[PDB]
């Protein structure tokens, strides 16, 4: 196709939770429109100074009225020089990017829910007599990840699944609040704005929905599995640094 000059701003809303593809959505967007693309290891490796801006915009977000104003204010800062979101703590505020972003587009990523819990168990939330918990937190420390990082996650969680507070060690809970999440989603926006993506589809329903062509030769992004994070998380203990072993994980990071 024809080559065109692309806008820089939110295009693409993506409101699939964790663990359901958004680091391969990441590299995918980020392969069609050759502009960054918001996700948590965007947080994590360029932009820890974000951490208390979400964590601020979250503390505020219970509140068009003019507290509201202020709040999109802050989301449109944020987001400043990127073409799309995806993850934590992004994807919980898909209602109000929709409002702020009128001309983006709105992605669901979904799977299997046990997958999920499984994927999630693993690398975003372990339980917390899960021995593997605390190779996670001594992997995170030498990012420079704290206690604050993972105060983000789970209050993104919260506001994501609207609960004012949750019990993270409880499966039955967790499974129950993804399912209406993902229910409440595709109640909530419009079906001609709206794609459902499954783990494994690829550029194709992708492209055809963002009226691209499918990137010449480029394989769909298979990145961040939770095997991938666990090796990144050794790798991280082992050598105590980011960029000793950065080059070995060219893609997810
Ligand atoms: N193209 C693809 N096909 C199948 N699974 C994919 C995929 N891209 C990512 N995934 C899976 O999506 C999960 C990561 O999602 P996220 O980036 O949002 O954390 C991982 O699941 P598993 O941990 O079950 O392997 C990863 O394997
Ligand atoms: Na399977």
Same mark, same amino acid.
């Given at each position: 196709?024809?080559?065109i000059e692309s806008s820089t701003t939110i295009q693409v809303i993506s409101a699939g939770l964790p663990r359901t593809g958004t680091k391969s959505l990441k590299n995918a967007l980020e392969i069609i429109?050759?502009?960054?693309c918001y996700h948590m290891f965007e947080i994590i490796f360029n932009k820890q100074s974000d951490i208390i801006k979400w964590q601020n915009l979250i503390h505020d977000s219970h509140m068009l009225t003019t507290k509201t104003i202020a709040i999109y &204010?802050?989301?449109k800062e944020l987001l400043d020089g990127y073409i799309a /979101? /995806?993850?934590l703590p992004t994807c919980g505020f898909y209602k109000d990017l929709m409002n702020i972003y009128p001309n983006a587009k709105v992605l669901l990523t979904i799977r299997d829910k046990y997958d999920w819990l499984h994927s999630l168990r693993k690398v975003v939330l372990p339980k917390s007599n899960d021995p593997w918990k605390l190779k996670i937190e001594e992997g995170d420390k030498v990012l420079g990840l704290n206690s604050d990082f993972y105060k983000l996650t789970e209050d993104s969680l919260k +506001?994501? +699944?609207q609960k004012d507070d949750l019990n993270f060690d409880d499966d039955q809970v967790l499974l129950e609040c993804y399912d209406e999440?993902?229910?409440?989603?595709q109640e909530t926006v419009p079906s001609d704005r709206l794609l459902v993506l499954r783990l494994g589809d690829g550029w194709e329903p992708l492209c055809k929905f963002l009226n691209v062509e499918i990137p010449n030769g480029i394989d769909y992004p298979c990145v961040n599995s939770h095997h991938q994070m666990t090796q990144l998380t050794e790798q991280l203990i082992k050598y105590k640094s980011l960029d000793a072993i950065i080059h070995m +994980?060219? &893609?997810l990071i």
């Open positions: 196709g024809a080559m429109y050759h502009k960054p &204010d802050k989301l /979101t /995806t993850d +506001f994501a +699944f999440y993902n229910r409440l989603v +994980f060219p &893609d």
